[PDB]
Subunit: 340 residues, 4 copies
């Protein structure tokens, strides 16, 4: 009757109505190819807000044109993006949800034409372009891009900011020795490989004091790569720097075979949560209320992130409530339909 | 694999991608109380379009201020409504769906303050206001209101127009002897009680040649009321007047106890379909793809109208496809989620 | 709350606790190949009784060795079968269900080695053995086999007897002009083609006064075959002969392509029910309580026969009750599990 | 496609076809009140075997008349019980499943009329009878009862034996300081409170070398009671004594409020599994294949025990397979129904 899934959760004064989070998912719907919010986004995101999702994280938003995954990504490299993002924020919040945004940079995995950058001039695979080895100017420049992105998100009115340090993208590339072969202060050791992430966090915190999320790939799924245990010290530091919650994913630094199954990334979320003593978000094949409640009640994570399931059904929270025999507030307009 | 539910259906050159129709449902979301389309409607309806609903029928829209059910209904009594409706139409169609609108007049069941009109000065119940017995001027005036509504819907860009002659509202009141005690040419016989509906249809057809729906209450659930068989002759006439499909509902002319169960109004839809030889829409507790397919394949109706189920899940078509082991086109953005 | 699906139904003093019937389904589990009831049957059938199925119809039971579909069918051609059948009956009824048996003869569709019999020496298809054209001695002999089967079922303690006149088997072959080319009193006209069925019914009624079912194939799905309308006169006669309910199926007299979909045989059940004025059983892709309730409430059939669905879940009635928001008596042992 | 839930598991040469176990559940169906297997049990258990459950654990079976929970429990205090149990075993295994039995003694929680025994003369609650403080003769006697029960189970042909040391029953009472106030070698310390369990295990192992399970209550849910961590040393010893798997439950030593939720006992199973380095069984609100797969793949347990869910649906494994997109061997009789 009284579940944890539909119990409020507060982060730095921001109270989420429940533990349900819409995981950041690229829509590749910027038809103008200028990183601008389009009509699609204005229908896509607010629909989940009506569905009673507590927190909606907007897809990976490129902090630079080269930082995009594709030419159809959302962008935040220009003050001109603020208006569209502000409109999106207004629409989502107006319908009851808190809204966040995922600041991102694809790095060597960018599919945008032209030069792409990485810690080292090593391609993702034999079929990918060789990225440019970033100079220290490029580094502080990219850090500034993240800070500016954060400032624009703040102006747009976002409630939450997430730093995308996962899925083998730019920050993840600095993190993993598989991609980071630098021999300056940005590579060659756990501390050095973390530096870039540390500087991004600090820069963001200069202009942003709201809830701050970091999304990581807890594992590289490679013998010579990173494991969940490597991220425990990193999470402790993130905590000291004022990161509020770790959004725990995994993989994609290089091509690799992964054993995918229900809750396959949950152990990573709990590892960091209990060892680094920091709130975590669980993601990866979470599709049922029954499943989500188990994750919460057993203290494996504090928030549950839903991906593809929210693509199949934007009103998932209602089905989850039914599933758990719980009752939640429905939009007044849908009360006749939302029966418990 | 190849179901009827997800097979196209053509009405007067308008081809629906499937047989799934979103039944007209009042949202009471016109906070400005001027019948204007609001932000809510612009999120509510297009969401079902993304969900792959073939035809979306907009809620009962008052053809006059007094014709509204409540002060929060949509309205179409002014050319000023066209802009908002046109924007709504654009949003819905842009996301893949055909769009219709339900022209309505609450009659004696209107809850709007002030005078309300009906065929006879008989209240809905002992707790309702006594309506004014319409004069012949009121009648031709109300007919003109429907015509103007149709013209505005056409300008807005609607694909389908439905005339709301059901649920005990104005037109239904002229139809049922329970509410129509007039002793002129508009009451006293089956032919006379039909006159008002006939004139509305003709007037609408003067300015509208697209798909035309009529929604009826096949039964009054009263010993001295109308039965499904009474509507067979009416459907034959509607057919002659150029009505393309009969949206078959029931009840609500007066307070009455109804036996509600799955598909409880389907027999009415099939009765009219086979006896009047006219395409029909089935509505009333249709909630599963399995159920909807049975209705179609057995020739009980040509379209299936979903109500509350589309309130619980705007992407119902996907679940129905899964349910039937069928595969349908998903919005490109949701392909990773919409697995078959 | 009070559904029709879980409302009692009385046939000749036999009261079924609900409208749910387990359709006769061959298990091919007589490993001894002597038509004897085996351990499998003693677990298979009583499980559905615990599941709260109102009436359980035992699979097609060969009234003669040659009358079996396969060497692994149940048999009733010997008094020696009574003991096993009586044990089965005891087990099923002990757990709350009424029990019936389907008296059967495969005819030309028998796959048992050796001579097989039919109205005419016409094979099922070019890949099947040519059956012997039955003599009038064979006919009255086969009729006697059905009577003896009925007598043994009575001794075993069965509550209901069904005559299998469907799925292109022996009796169905006499019924359909596609297979019956006889030029005596058993072919050449509707009356003559019915004679065999008529004689079987009379013979059974000589030794059995309990509920009597007849299972028919309402359609041959062939231009020159039988249609549902042909069976209306037949059902009227069956009624006069004391047949209590018509179990309405279809097809299988010859190879043919059938359009299979949810409730695809329901229109046949309702046709006979309303035109012949006789209780009918609906069967064919009935899998949900929602669906079953619609069939009942709309008077399309009086009993609902479940096939493969009861193979997937023997406790279907519980799921159906949940589905309909209804509550039914659970076996006291399962009360903690069977929550409503 | 290849899940862990439907992957074989071997314990001491006994190979289970999958990881699905039917948790021991009292049926209170011994109407003769002599601990004898009845018809009900012979239908109840084999049904789950057909449902493709890998291992079926028979309900708590009293090793003495006073050791029963109720007068309707199964019993094994007499060689006369062997015949009935052997028949049950035959029925279950014949239909594809391995079978186990739970040797039990209710202790102070017995509801059987007359004297009841416990480590100390302390009632379960103020509403329960005061049990007799067992003498050392009673102890070695009760140990002998367990050994004899094991010997009879072996003769009956059981594949697995489980010792019921949980749910606040006799053995659990010796384990918990809440109920054990003895001041001899059987109380007053962790080692002493374990002694009784240790002696039961040894005695059972004298006459039984097959798979041996022990079911424990990992927590008393009481400030002065046992916690999961207390059972880590116990599990290490059980391992040394030849216990093959720990069936991990919790609670019921005294009245207490428990927070019940999906997988609420899983953390206990994983604790013991990883800390004591011994295979464990997870139980407690496990109802979906999705859930069960997560438990297995994440190494939280080696076997998954289903309780009430197998009461709602004896063929759960089929639904779980569907749920996981996996395909498993269906009983050849149900192949047409069991579609994947
Ligand atoms: C279409 C699609 C787009 C995605 N884009 C992003 C993204 O922009 N940022 C991100 O962190 N993860 C992205 N992912 C991963 C999802 O956020 C989510 O973590 C992943 O799909 C696993 O969650 P799920 O199994 O519940 O779907 C995307 C996934 C999908 C299916
Ligand atoms: C909230 C709500 C508003 C409705 N408003 C309308 C309406 O404006 N026009 C109409 O014809 N029917 C209206 N109805 C009836 C629905 O269109 C539909 O026919 C009815 O709810 C039965 O369908 P269902 O059982 O699938 O929900 C409304 C129903 C609901 C629940
Ligand atoms: C395995 C199996 C065995 C069957 N054996 C019989 C039978 O013995 N007698 C009969 O009349 N129909 C038999 N049929 C048809 C069923 O009785 C039932 O009418 C048909 O399968 C449609 O039911 P369903 O769609 O609900 O599964 C059998 C069907 C199956 C799948
Ligand atoms: C009707 C019933 C009888 C039970 N009897 C036993 C029993 O004999 N032995 C035992 O160890 N647990 C018994 N329990 C507990 C179950 O074995 C199981 O561990 C508990 O019900 C949790 O399982 P579930 O949540 O999956 O249903 C019983 C539970 C129920 C509901």
């Amino acid at each position: 009757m009284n579940t944890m899934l539909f119990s409020p959760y507060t982060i730095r004064g921001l109270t989420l109505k429940n533990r349900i989070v819409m995981s950041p998912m690229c829509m590749y719907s910027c038809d103008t190819k200028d990183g601008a919010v389009r009509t699609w986004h204005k229908i896509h995101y607010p629909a989940r807000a009506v569905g009673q999702v507590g927190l909606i994280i907007v897809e990976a938003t490129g902090v630079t044109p080269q930082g995009r995954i594709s030419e159809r990504d959302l962008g935040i490299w220009s003050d001109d993006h603020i208006a569209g993002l502000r409109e999106l924020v207004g629409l989502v919040k107006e319908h009851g949800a808190a809204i966040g945004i995922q600041l991102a940079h694809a790095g060597r995995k960018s599919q945008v034409p032209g030069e792409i950058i990485a810690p080292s001039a090593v391609p993702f695979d034999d079929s990918s372009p060789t990225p440019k080895e970033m100079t220290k100017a490029d580094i502080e420049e990219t850090v500034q891009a993240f800070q500016n992105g954060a400032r624009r998100a703040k102006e747009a009115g976002f409630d939450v900011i997430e730093i995308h340090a996962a899925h083998g993208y730019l920050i993840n590339e600095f993190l993993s020795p598989l991609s980071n072969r630098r021999q300056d202060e940005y590579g060659g050791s756990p501390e050095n490989r973390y530096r870039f992430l540390g500087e991004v966090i600090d820069a963001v915190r200069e202009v942003w004091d709201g809830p701050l999320f970091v999304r990581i790939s807890a594992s590289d799924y490679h013998p010579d790569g990173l494991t969940a245990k490597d991220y425990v010290p990193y999470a402790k530091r993130m905590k000291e720097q004022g990161v509020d919650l770790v959004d725990v994913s995994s993989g994609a630094i290089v091509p690799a075979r992964m054993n995918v199954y229900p809750g396959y990334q949950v152990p990573f979320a709990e590892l960091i949560r209990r060892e680094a003593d920091i709130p975590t978000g669980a993601v990866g094949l979470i599709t049922s209320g029954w499943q989500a409640e188990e994750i919460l009640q057993n203290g494996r994570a504090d928030l549950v992130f839903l991906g593809r399931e929210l693509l199949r059904n934007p009103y998932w929270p209602y089905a989850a409530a039914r599933e758990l025999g719980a009752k939640i507030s429905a939009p007044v307009q849908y009360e006749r339909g939302w029966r418990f």
